[PDB]
Amino acid sequence: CPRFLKVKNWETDVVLTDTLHLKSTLETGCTEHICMGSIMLPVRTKDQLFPLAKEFLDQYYSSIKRFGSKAHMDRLEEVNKEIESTSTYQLKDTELIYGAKHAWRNASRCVGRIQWSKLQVFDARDCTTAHGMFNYICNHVKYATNKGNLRSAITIFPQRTDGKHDFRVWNSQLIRYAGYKQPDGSTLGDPANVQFTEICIQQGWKAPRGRFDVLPLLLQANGNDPELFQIPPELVLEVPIRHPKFDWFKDLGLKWYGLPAVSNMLLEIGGLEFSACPFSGWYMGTEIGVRDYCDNSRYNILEEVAKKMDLDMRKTSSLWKDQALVEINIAVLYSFQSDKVTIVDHHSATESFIKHMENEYRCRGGCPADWVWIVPPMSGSITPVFHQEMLNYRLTPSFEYQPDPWNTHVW
Numbered sequence: 001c002p003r004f005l006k007v008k009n010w011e012t013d014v015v016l017t018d019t020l021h022l023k024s025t026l027e028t029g030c031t032e033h034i035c036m037g038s039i040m041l042p043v044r045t046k047d048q049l050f051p052l053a054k055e056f057l058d059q060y061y062s063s064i065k066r067f068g069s070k071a072h073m074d075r076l077e078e079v080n081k082e083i084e085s086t087s088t089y090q091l092k093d094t095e096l097i098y099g100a101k102h103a104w105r106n107a108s109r110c111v112g113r114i115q116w117s118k119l120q121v122f123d124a125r126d127c128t129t130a131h132g133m134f135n136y137i138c139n140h141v142k143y144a145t146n147k148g149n150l151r152s153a154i155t156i157f158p159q160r161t162d163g164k165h166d167f168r169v170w171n172s173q174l175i176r177y178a179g180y181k182q183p184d185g186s187t188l189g190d191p192a193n194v195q196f197t198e199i200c201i202q203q204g205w206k207a208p209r210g211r212f213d214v215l216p217l218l219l220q221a222n223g224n225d226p227e228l229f230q231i232p233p234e235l236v237l238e239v240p241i242r243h244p245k246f247d248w249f250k251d252l253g254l255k256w257y258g259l260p261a262v263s264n265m266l267l268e269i270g271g272l273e274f275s276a277c278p279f280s281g282w283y284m285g286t287e288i289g290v291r292d293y294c295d296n297s298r299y300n301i302l303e304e305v306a307k308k309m310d311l312d313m314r315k316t317s318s319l320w321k322d323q324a325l326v327e328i329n330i331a332v333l334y335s336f337q338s339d340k341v342t343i344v345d346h347h348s349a350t351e352s353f354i355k356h357m358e359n360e361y362r363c364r365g366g367c368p369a370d371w372v373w374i375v376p377p378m379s380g381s382i383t384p385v386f387h388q389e390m391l392n393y394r395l396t397p398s399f400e401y402q403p404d405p406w407n408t409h410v411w
């Protein structure tokens with residue numbers, strides 16, 4: 001802008017002023033001579049820990065307008081001494097909830113953040129076993145699902161200590177379908193999960209060898225060998241995909257699960273690392289309809305579908321893929337709604353995100369947003385976020401990526 005940063009919506013000419021980026025700690029990958037905005041992915045000593053701890057506490061106490069208080073100050077000595085003795089420290093329940101809700105709030109890749117303050121935090125820091133993990137996770141799933149009226153939730157397992165005793169949910173999501181490679185060449189189910197399916201089988205999973213087989217949970221507690229568990233099927237809500245007009249759509253036998261629940265990410269609060277912190281909300285229809293169903297590397301159903309629309313697949317210029325994609329996504333939304341399972345369309349979601357974005361600038365002086373991820377993978381320019389300039393930067397607490405457990409743990 002003039003002296004501090006401005007973003008603009010070119011459809012509405014609204015301008016917003018960003019000051020929040022000046023708090024940004026972490027680094028983006030971009031430099032003054034290269035932009036890495038479209039790049040997917042650009043323990044800790046005692047000494048590294050206290051700055052990060054104090055930085056978080058200062059923020060937490062500044063959030064409740066008690067910055068610089070006795071409570072604030074004693075808490076600082078309290079934690080400083082915890083780190084000398086024990087090389088770590090423990091978050092109060094209140095701080096844990098603040099941290100978690102704010103990690104969501106700072107998640108620059110998430111279009112749903114208008115919901116950020118409405119999150120259930122299940123503290124599972126007392127868990128010591130894979131079995132306990134299974135119990136916490138089942139409870140999360142059942143709570144979150146809520147018989148179709150979805151509720152946002154996260155379950156936080158014990159924090160990392162010496163890198164030799166961390167909790168990992170080896171699953172990328174709590175609920176995902178298996179993927180089966182064949183020397184036939186082809187692949188049955190979800191190909192994103194083929195290797196993971198292999199690990200499960202090479203750990204004794206009795207694979208039904210079907211298309212939409214819900215995978216077992218594979219749970220690592222205290223750094224031990226991970227252990228298999230079948231989520232109770234009655235806890236796994238699913239939607240058969242049919243079309244509001246094309247009654248032949250049922251015949252494709254599509255089904256998806258209703259509960260999107262990410263389980264491979266790392267939650268960072270006050271320098272502490274929670275390597276097992278599965279979290280869930282509800283689906284934007286395009287996640288299933290466009291990416292899950294139509295990505296070439298995923299279920300890849302575009303050919304099968306468009307074929308059954310008497311479509312012109314001779315050349316790409318008929319836009320037969322575009323047509324099939326729109327129908328597939330209509331069927332997804334219709335289905336979830338006919339089943340009274342929470343879902344949002346990309347028009348409504350992006351619309352609420354603009355509102356949220358403007359909310360955040362009003363009261364927080366900004367909102368970090370990653371345009372590349374915020375814009376839906378179909379019909380981009382007819383949603384409001386396509387035309388909205390966005391500033392991306394890294395605030396903390398945060399959810400981070402982390403290595404796949406099978407490329408580390410062994411024995």
Ligand code: HEM
Nearest residue numbers: 104107109110111112115152153279280281282283284399
């Ligand atoms: C309530 C409904 C929610 C909706 C509609 C929603 C929507 C989305 C969408 C569409 C994406 C992009 C995913 C993709 O295209 O692969 C995403 C990413 C993400 N969401 Fe949200 N979300 C919701 C709830 C939550 C919650 C409860 C959390 C955590 C507290 C969260 C944190 C994140 C994070 C960390 C990412 C980035 C994933 C990555 O970088 O791989 N979201 N969200």
Ligand SMILES: COCCCNc1cncc(CCc2cc(C)cc(N)n2)c1
Nearest residue numbers: 040260261262279280281282283284287
């Ligand atoms: C490939 O490396 C990065 C992995 C991409 N992340 C990613 C992939 N598929 C699905 C997701 C689900 C994201 C999500 C999470 C939540 C809590 C809700 C929602 N609607 N969507 C995330």
Ligand SMILES: C[C@H](O)[C@H](O)[C@H]1CNc2nc(N)[nH]c(=O)c2N1
Nearest residue numbers: 037038039040372373374375377
């Ligand atoms: C290359 C590019 O960064 C990558 O394909 C991104 C683009 N935008 C995305 N946006 C969402 N919501 N989800 C994704 O997986 C991706 N993939």
Ligand SMILES: [Zn+2]
Nearest residue numbers: 030035036037
């Ligand atoms: Zn950049």
